[PDB]
Design an enzyme around this catalytic site. Structure first.
Site, PDB file in Angstrom:
ATOM      1  N   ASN A 157       0.810  -1.200   0.000  1.00 34.15           N
ATOM      2  CA  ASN A 157       0.000   0.000   0.000  1.00 34.15           C
ATOM      3  C   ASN A 157       0.857   1.270   0.000  1.00 34.15           C
ATOM      4  OD1 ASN A 157      -1.433   0.240   3.423  1.00 34.15           O
ATOM      5  ND2 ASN A 157       0.705   0.452   2.676  1.00 34.15           N
ATOM      6  N   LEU A 158       2.177   1.085  -0.025  1.00 32.11           N
ATOM      7  CA  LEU A 158       3.132   2.158  -0.102  1.00 32.11           C
ATOM      8  C   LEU A 158       3.006   3.169   0.999  1.00 32.11           C
ATOM      9  CD1 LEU A 158       2.625   2.575  -3.947  1.00 32.11           C
ATOM     10  CD2 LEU A 158       4.326   1.274  -2.887  1.00 32.11           C
ATOM     11  N   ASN A 164       4.806   2.959   3.548  1.00 30.66           N
ATOM     12  CA  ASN A 164       6.147   3.079   4.097  1.00 30.66           C
ATOM     13  C   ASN A 164       7.229   2.714   3.125  1.00 30.66           C
ATOM     14  OD1 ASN A 164       7.380   4.848   6.362  1.00 30.66           O
ATOM     15  ND2 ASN A 164       8.389   2.857   6.608  1.00 30.66           N
ATOM     16  N   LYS A 219       5.267  -1.038  12.125  1.00 33.39           N
ATOM     17  CA  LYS A 219       6.284  -1.601  13.019  1.00 33.39           C
ATOM     18  C   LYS A 219       7.022  -0.650  13.921  1.00 33.39           C
ATOM     19  CE  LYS A 219      10.211  -0.953  10.023  1.00 33.39           C
ATOM     20  NZ  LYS A 219      11.526  -1.438   9.503  1.00 33.39           N
ATOM     21  N   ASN A 274      -3.848  -2.825  11.381  1.00 30.85           N
ATOM     22  CA  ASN A 274      -2.950  -3.199  10.317  1.00 30.85           C
ATOM     23  C   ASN A 274      -2.325  -4.537  10.523  1.00 30.85           C
ATOM     24  OD1 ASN A 274      -2.321  -1.214   8.015  1.00 30.85           O
ATOM     25  ND2 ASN A 274      -2.625   0.080   9.859  1.00 30.85           N
ATOM     26  N   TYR A 313       2.683  -3.082  19.392  1.00 29.09           N
ATOM     27  CA  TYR A 313       3.320  -3.719  18.279  1.00 29.09           C
ATOM     28  C   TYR A 313       3.669  -5.147  18.634  1.00 29.09           C
ATOM     29  CZ  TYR A 313       7.106  -5.238  15.192  1.00 29.09           C
ATOM     30  OH  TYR A 313       7.940  -5.936  14.301  1.00 29.09           O
ATOM     31  N   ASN A 367      17.439  -8.666  14.847  1.00 28.04           N
ATOM     32  CA  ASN A 367      17.620  -7.271  14.454  1.00 28.04           C
ATOM     33  C   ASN A 367      18.168  -7.097  13.043  1.00 28.04           C
ATOM     34  OD1 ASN A 367      17.579  -7.463  17.335  1.00 28.04           O
ATOM     35  ND2 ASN A 367      17.728  -5.222  17.285  1.00 28.04           N
ATOM     36  N   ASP A 385      13.197  -1.317  26.773  1.00 25.96           N
ATOM     37  CA  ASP A 385      14.335  -2.074  26.278  1.00 25.96           C
ATOM     38  C   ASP A 385      14.860  -3.112  27.250  1.00 25.96           C
ATOM     39  OD1 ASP A 385      14.649  -0.647  23.664  1.00 25.96           O
ATOM     40  OD2 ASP A 385      16.330   0.591  24.540  1.00 25.96           O
ATOM     41  N   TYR A 387      19.957  -9.907  24.462  1.00 20.85           N
ATOM     42  CA  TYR A 387      19.374 -11.150  23.996  1.00 20.85           C
ATOM     43  C   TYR A 387      19.855 -11.424  22.600  1.00 20.85           C
ATOM     44  CZ  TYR A 387      15.649  -8.288  21.758  1.00 20.85           C
ATOM     45  OH  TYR A 387      14.976  -7.362  20.989  1.00 20.85           O
TER      46      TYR A 387
HETATM   47  N1  LIG Z   1      12.707  -4.244  10.431  1.00 17.74           N
HETATM   48  C1  LIG Z   1      12.732  -4.812  11.671  1.00 17.74           C
HETATM   49  O1  LIG Z   1      13.595  -4.502  12.550  1.00 17.74           O
HETATM   50  C2  LIG Z   1      11.764  -5.827  12.114  1.00 17.74           C
HETATM   51  C3  LIG Z   1      12.158  -6.902  13.094  1.00 17.74           C
HETATM   52  C4  LIG Z   1      11.147  -8.034  13.161  1.00 17.74           C
HETATM   53  C5  LIG Z   1       9.971  -8.021  12.521  1.00 17.74           C
HETATM   54  N2  LIG Z   1       9.744  -7.144  11.419  1.00 17.74           N
HETATM   55  C6  LIG Z   1       8.602  -7.300  10.540  1.00 17.74           C
HETATM   56  O2  LIG Z   1       8.985  -7.559   9.216  1.00 17.74           O
HETATM   57  C7  LIG Z   1       8.004  -6.986   8.322  1.00 17.74           C
HETATM   58  C8  LIG Z   1       8.754  -6.180   7.321  1.00 17.74           C
HETATM   59  O3  LIG Z   1       9.611  -5.285   8.043  1.00 17.74           O
HETATM   60  P1  LIG Z   1      10.317  -4.091   7.251  1.00 17.74           P
HETATM   61  O4  LIG Z   1      11.533  -3.612   7.982  1.00 17.74           O
HETATM   62  O5  LIG Z   1      10.619  -4.582   5.892  1.00 17.74           O
HETATM   63  O6  LIG Z   1       9.320  -2.848   7.150  1.00 17.74           O
HETATM   64  P2  LIG Z   1       8.901  -1.870   6.005  1.00 17.74           P
HETATM   65  O7  LIG Z   1       8.071  -0.764   6.535  1.00 17.74           O
HETATM   66  O8  LIG Z   1      10.062  -1.355   5.172  1.00 17.74           O
HETATM   67  O9  LIG Z   1       7.962  -2.839   5.164  1.00 17.74           O
HETATM   68  C9  LIG Z   1       6.566  -2.842   5.450  1.00 17.74           C
HETATM   69  C10 LIG Z   1       5.865  -2.676   4.156  1.00 17.74           C
HETATM   70  O10 LIG Z   1       4.446  -2.961   4.336  1.00 17.74           O
HETATM   71  C11 LIG Z   1       3.668  -2.004   3.711  1.00 17.74           C
HETATM   72  N3  LIG Z   1       2.368  -1.960   4.394  1.00 17.74           N
HETATM   73  C12 LIG Z   1       2.113  -1.569   5.669  1.00 17.74           C
HETATM   74  N4  LIG Z   1       0.845  -1.792   6.066  1.00 17.74           N
HETATM   75  C13 LIG Z   1       0.248  -2.358   4.969  1.00 17.74           C
HETATM   76  C14 LIG Z   1      -1.081  -2.774   4.771  1.00 17.74           C
HETATM   77  N5  LIG Z   1      -2.025  -2.718   5.725  1.00 17.74           N
HETATM   78  N6  LIG Z   1      -1.351  -3.258   3.536  1.00 17.74           N
HETATM   79  C15 LIG Z   1      -0.387  -3.267   2.564  1.00 17.74           C
HETATM   80  N7  LIG Z   1       0.848  -2.897   2.667  1.00 17.74           N
HETATM   81  C16 LIG Z   1       1.136  -2.427   3.903  1.00 17.74           C
HETATM   82  C17 LIG Z   1       4.509  -0.753   3.821  1.00 17.74           C
HETATM   83  O11 LIG Z   1       4.102   0.174   2.809  1.00 17.74           O
HETATM   84  C18 LIG Z   1       5.949  -1.286   3.553  1.00 17.74           C
HETATM   85  O12 LIG Z   1       6.275  -1.360   2.146  1.00 17.74           O
HETATM   86  C19 LIG Z   1       7.003  -6.236   9.205  1.00 17.74           C
HETATM   87  O13 LIG Z   1       5.842  -6.999   9.525  1.00 17.74           O
HETATM   88  C20 LIG Z   1       7.861  -6.027  10.455  1.00 17.74           C
HETATM   89  O14 LIG Z   1       7.002  -5.965  11.558  1.00 17.74           O
HETATM   90  C21 LIG Z   1      10.688  -6.177  11.180  1.00 17.74           C
HETATM   91  O1  LIG Z   2      19.230   5.484  18.580  1.00 15.11           O
HETATM   92  C1  LIG Z   2      19.281   4.392  19.099  1.00 15.11           C
HETATM   93  C2  LIG Z   2      18.628   3.226  18.682  1.00 15.11           C
HETATM   94  C3  LIG Z   2      18.846   2.112  19.346  1.00 15.11           C
HETATM   95  N1  LIG Z   2      19.698   2.010  20.440  1.00 15.11           N
HETATM   96  C4  LIG Z   2      19.976   0.691  21.071  1.00 15.11           C
HETATM   97  O2  LIG Z   2      20.283  -0.213  20.049  1.00 15.11           O
HETATM   98  C5  LIG Z   2      19.743  -1.547  20.338  1.00 15.11           C
HETATM   99  C6  LIG Z   2      18.841  -2.023  19.243  1.00 15.11           C
HETATM  100  O3  LIG Z   2      17.782  -1.064  19.203  1.00 15.11           O
HETATM  101  P1  LIG Z   2      16.873  -1.031  17.922  1.00 15.11           P
HETATM  102  O4  LIG Z   2      17.537  -0.959  16.595  1.00 15.11           O
HETATM  103  O5  LIG Z   2      15.894   0.053  18.023  1.00 15.11           O
HETATM  104  O6  LIG Z   2      16.322  -2.551  18.079  1.00 15.11           O
HETATM  105  P2  LIG Z   2      15.275  -3.267  18.928  1.00 15.11           P
HETATM  106  O7  LIG Z   2      14.793  -2.387  20.027  1.00 15.11           O
HETATM  107  O8  LIG Z   2      15.949  -4.399  19.565  1.00 15.11           O
HETATM  108  O9  LIG Z   2      13.940  -3.764  18.073  1.00 15.11           O
HETATM  109  C7  LIG Z   2      14.023  -4.361  16.768  1.00 15.11           C
HETATM  110  O10 LIG Z   2      14.176  -5.789  16.852  1.00 15.11           O
HETATM  111  C8  LIG Z   2      13.095  -6.501  17.496  1.00 15.11           C
HETATM  112  C9  LIG Z   2      13.392  -8.015  17.430  1.00 15.11           C
HETATM  113  O11 LIG Z   2      14.486  -8.349  18.293  1.00 15.11           O
HETATM  114  C10 LIG Z   2      11.773  -6.265  16.793  1.00 15.11           C
HETATM  115  O12 LIG Z   2      10.855  -6.812  17.728  1.00 15.11           O
HETATM  116  C11 LIG Z   2      11.512  -4.796  16.388  1.00 15.11           C
HETATM  117  O13 LIG Z   2      10.483  -4.778  15.346  1.00 15.11           O
HETATM  118  C12 LIG Z   2      12.796  -4.102  15.882  1.00 15.11           C
HETATM  119  O14 LIG Z   2      12.598  -2.706  15.596  1.00 15.11           O
HETATM  120  C13 LIG Z   2      19.040  -1.415  21.662  1.00 15.11           C
HETATM  121  O15 LIG Z   2      19.808  -1.844  22.808  1.00 15.11           O
HETATM  122  C14 LIG Z   2      18.756   0.079  21.708  1.00 15.11           C
HETATM  123  O16 LIG Z   2      18.744   0.444  23.092  1.00 15.11           O
HETATM  124  C15 LIG Z   2      20.333   3.093  20.913  1.00 15.11           C
HETATM  125  O17 LIG Z   2      21.066   3.071  21.882  1.00 15.11           O
HETATM  126  N2  LIG Z   2      20.078   4.237  20.221  1.00 15.11           N
END
Ligand SMILES: NC(=O)c1ccc[n+]([C@@H]2O[C@H](COP(=O)([O-])OP(=O)(O)OC[C@H]3O[C@@H](n4cnc5c(N)ncnc54)[C@H](O)[C@@H]3O)[C@@H](O)[C@H]2O)c1
Ligand SMILES: O=c1ccn([C@@H]2O[C@H](COP(=O)(O)OP(=O)(O)O[C@H]3O[C@H](CO)[C@@H](O)[C@H](O)[C@H]3O)[C@@H](O)[C@H]2O)c(=O)[nH]1
Ligand SMILES: NC(=O)c1ccc[n+]([C@@H]2O[C@H](COP(=O)([O-])OP(=O)(O)OC[C@H]3O[C@@H](n4cnc5c(N)ncnc54)[C@H](O)[C@@H]3O)[C@@H](O)[C@H]2O)c1
Ligand SMILES: O=c1ccn([C@@H]2O[C@H](COP(=O)(O)OP(=O)(O)O[C@H]3O[C@H](CO)[C@@H](O)[C@H](O)[C@H]3O)[C@@H](O)[C@H]2O)c(=O)[nH]1
Ligand code: NA
Ligand code: NA
Ligand code: NA
Ligand code: NA
Lengths: 338, 338
Positions: A32-33, A35, A84, A99, A149, A179, A295, A299
């Site tokens: 859906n763009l 993000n 997210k 969502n 979330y 991560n 936080d 882990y």
């Molecule tokens: N990036 C991370 O740190 C993190 C860690 C674990 C889990 N995840 C999960 O992985 C998936 C992808 O993560 P990402 O980093 O690529 O994020 P991202 O935002 O770059 O990708 C999400 C995409 O989904 C689209 N979108 C959002 N809501 C929608 C909807 N209702 N219908 C259609 N399209 C929709 C956005 O436009 C975007 O292109 C997410 O579900 C996120 O929760 C990500």
């Molecule tokens: O400006 C910043 C951003 C992060 N951190 C630290 O960096 C580490 C990682 O932080 P961040 O990149 O924000 O990662 P997470 O909080 O661990 O969360 C990510 O990873 C998780 C899975 O482990 C998912 O649940 C989430 O979607 C995803 O955003 C942590 O100790 C944060 O405290 C800082 O000190 N400064």
């Protein structure tokens, strides 16, 4: 295979799509763009070496989902679509539940209607909640996420599991990401956050590129070797590859397959900064800030299972994660064009 | 007050509506009649002594919900609408999650849109999960329900709590019902299950009325005084009254108000049967059957909180619960007309 990739234009989705196309699968992207931008599509085709079909739409639109699935004779679905931003989730719970929870529910319902029973879900280490036992293993019972979330991802895991029980022919993968960081080696694709990046790496990159002053390090008093937070950083390409394999190997294999996707090792905040300073050839500016609400101190994943069962493991290093991000960041300072 | 009563034509809803009308509130009922009939409406008006407005619709229809709320200048919402057959829930999870989780989400979203911030939710003792500590107190942490039904109620509790945090002016009551039974004293209103009743009382009544042969008692080997399951049976009228009070007292009182609604005492299966035999003047036929999957052996509510805080407590007895059910059952053997 014929695969529907929701959220295919996003960070992880885009990279996965490239990999899928490289393995000759037919990819249909649904996004859906909200993000991401269409500007990535060309890049995905190029780097993928094959054309992926793109449909602008919402996972919440169950009739559209059904039509797509049907129209394209989809075999399997990889669901990355969703919201997210943890912080935001706290401020705006409804949007997250809609969502993510409703979004997934509409999609799997459309699947059911279309007779599609192969599914891959983007889950997260957050589902483990506040687990003192580290690394985290899949057989650990889930905990209670501290944000809307995290809760939304756990809920979806639960619903998916219940669905499979009721519809035992379904093959469902719960991929718990750790991560994700890094970018395509080409430096032509990568993470493109809009506004202030919430994750460590992009934030560092922005400091490095000169956009931001200093990196705020959230807490220097944790019970870690260096007092900074520790996490399991995994390269987006390794993640991408793991999805390809999961998809290829699990299709038509009934069950709920849960796998942690990470490097299986922990790195502190400083380690990452250090890695990045090295990659960009200059010291990354940083400062210590107070702990960030919600936080955990440290882990990482226990990724044996995916190894054993899918023969999958990470191949990129932390260095590469840093280097690849710097390359993208530096080659495309303004991200994807409008 | 102006109150929207979802699921107002159902068992508990209908009785609550009568009580509300008796206290002079303006009631608007919203029901999709999937488990009730229009035939009750007249009865509710009569017994209520005032006309309640009825709208046939679905809680999942957020635009309709919004319009209603607006149109009727609603002040508070009492949400009884949803699916509740535990067994079915296991077989058909999606329907439960949609009707209950999505159903509630659409409703509260419509509320938000319409500036409505007073809410009452029909929750259940199931949220406590497998709690060995009995009776159950509100300050107990929640557990893990063993059905899609129970899970759906817990999820909604969670979402509602998160909503309130984000929208702190909201007044939200989480009314955890125990085991509702009984019927309006008039014997002109009551529970009207279609098909095989899943609950003890109606089933007993059906045996009694001659429709069924024997009551199957699920388990005779529990660790209870008589070996049969123990629960906290509460009269539907007491429940009704409690909603009226909750509604009147909590409106505009910001927070998440959680209250157990039960008699605060446990009664075994035999006790209930005995009570019913007495009421109908004949022995109720019964037999022992194996434990029913998912049943806990015994629990009841600790209802002090509602007493202290709302000055509310049950006033009807088990006898009356039985008598009132028998009266309805006997005066209306075919239930509400088609
Ligand atoms: N990036 C991370 O740190 C993190 C860690 C674990 C889990 N995840 C999960 O992985 C998936 C992808 O993560 P990402 O980093 O690529 O994020 P991202 O935002 O770059 O990708 C999400 C995409 O989904 C689209 N979108 C959002 N809501 C929608 C909807 N209702 N219908 C259609 N399209 C929709 C956005 O436009 C975007 O292109 C997410 O579900 C996120 O929760 C990500
Ligand atoms: O400006 C910043 C951003 C992060 N951190 C630290 O960096 C580490 C990682 O932080 P961040 O990149 O924000 O990662 P997470 O909080 O661990 O969360 C990510 O990873 C998780 C899975 O482990 C998912 O649940 C989430 O979607 C995803 O955003 C942590 O100790 C944060 O405290 C800082 O000190 N400064
Ligand atoms: N009866 C019990 O033992 C029990 C115990 C605790 C909790 N609860 C909860 O109390 C509430 C009321 O229980 P009840 O015994 O009165 O049940 P009921 O079936 O008699 O009432 C439910 C009503 O909701 C309506 N409905 C269902 N889904 C709807 C939807 N999506 N949109 C609009 N209307 C819809 C049905 O047509 C029915 O009139 C339910 O949420 C139930 O889960 C009941
Ligand atoms: O034919 C029957 C029906 C029930 N029972 C027993 O009677 C007791 C009560 O059973 P039932 O009426 O089905 O009640 P519950 O299983 O306790 O569940 C009800 O009460 C819960 C709150 O406590 C809610 O979560 C549910 O929505 C609601 O249906 C239990 O010990 C059952 O084992 C029998 O032996 N035979
Ligand atoms: Na807030
Ligand atoms: Na940009
Ligand atoms: Na089944
Ligand atoms: Na009937």
């Amino acid at each position: 295979m014929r695969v529907l990739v929701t959220g295919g234009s996003g960070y992880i989705g885009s990279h996965t799509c490239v990999q899928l196309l490289q393995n000759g699968h037919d990819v249909i992207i649904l996004d859906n763009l909200c993000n991401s931008k269409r500007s990535v599509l060309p890049v995905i085709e190029r780097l993928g070496g094959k054309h992926p079909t793109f449909v602008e739409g919402d996972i919440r639109n169950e009739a559209l989902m059904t039509e797509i699935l049907h129209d394209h004779a989809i075999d399997t679905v990889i669901h990355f679509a969703g919201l997210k931003a943890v912080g935001e989730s706290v401020q705006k719970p409804l949007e997250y539940y809609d969502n993510n929870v409703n979004g997934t529910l509409r999609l799997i319902s459309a699947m059911r209607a279309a007779n599609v029973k192969n599914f891959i879900f983007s889950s997260a280490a957050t589902v483990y909640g506040d687990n003192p036992k580290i690394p985290y293993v899949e057989s650990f019972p889930t905990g209670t996420p501290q944000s809307p979330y995290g809760k939304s991802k756990l809920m979806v895991e639960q619903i998916l599991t219940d669905l499979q029980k009721a519809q035992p022919d379904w093959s469902i993968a719960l991929l718990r990401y750790f991560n994700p960081v890094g970018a395509h080696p080409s430096g032509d694709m990568g993470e493109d956050p809009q506004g202030i990046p919430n994750n460590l790496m992009p934030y560092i990159a922005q400091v490095a590129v000169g956009r931001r002053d200093s990196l705020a390090i959230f807490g220097n008093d944790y019970p870690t070797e260096d007092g900074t937070g520790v996490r399991d950083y995994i390269h987006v390409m390794d993640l991408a590859d793991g999805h390809v394999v999961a998809m290829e190997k699990l299709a038509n294999k009934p069950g709920v397959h849960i796998y942690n996707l990470g490097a299986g090792v922990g790195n502190s905040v400083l380690d990452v900064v250090n890695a990045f300073s090295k990659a960009c050839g200059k010291p990354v500016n940083y400062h210590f800030a107070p702990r960030r609400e919600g936080d955990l101190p440290a882990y990482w994943a226990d990724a044996s299972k995916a190894d054993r069962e899918l023969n999958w493991r990470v191949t990129r290093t932390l260095d590469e994660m840093a280097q690849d991000t710097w390359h993208w960041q530096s080659r495309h300072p303004q991200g994807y064009p409008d």
